[PDB]
């Protein structure tokens, strides 16, 4: 109906509507936020030892803290 008169307008509105709506439905924006968060620009500053913390491991080989393992599995 309008596809014959101004076709570049209709194509622009279609791709604009998907560029607005399409970021809602996603299994990937959570991955976007995780990858964008997990990049250390600054130095990871240590902390004073004992406020009686049964967490936060001392050797960086110890997997007690939250590591990243979804990276190497894409």
């Amino acid at each position: 109906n309008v596809w014959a008169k101004e076709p570049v307008l209709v194509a622009s509105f279609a791709i604009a509507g998907l560029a607005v709506i399409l970021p809602t439905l996603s299994p990937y924006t959570k991955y976007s936020l995780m990858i964008n968060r997990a990049t250390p620009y600054n130095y990871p500053v240590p902390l004073r030892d004992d406020g009686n913390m049964p967490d936060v491991p001392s050797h960086p080989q110890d997997p007690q803290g939250p590591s990243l393992e979804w990276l190497k599995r894409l």
């Binding site: 990858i35 997990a38 990049t39 250390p40 620009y41 130095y43 990276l71 190497k72 894409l74």
Partner: protein, 68 residues
């Protein structure tokens, strides 16, 4: 004898058709090819981006451990 120039034995046909073969295919096939190649490029670009993200995190590890 006579030596004019008549048409000797008659001349054959001469075309005048608008003969345009209309090379190419339908436009729906053109949209299918364009969207397919575009999405192919998107997937390959996505994979290379996240590989360089992995290497960029490794370079961050270099600058962290190198600092004190």
């Amino acid at each position: 004898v006579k030596q004019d120039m008549p048409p000797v034995g008659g001349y054959g046909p001469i075309d005048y058709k608008r003969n345009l073969p209309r090379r190419g295919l339908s436009g729906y096939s053109m949209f299918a090819v364009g969207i397919g190649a575009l999405l192919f490029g998107y997937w390959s670009m996505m994979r290379w981006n996240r590989e360089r993200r992995r290497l960029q995190i490794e370079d961050f590890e270099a600058r962290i451990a190198l600092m004190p």
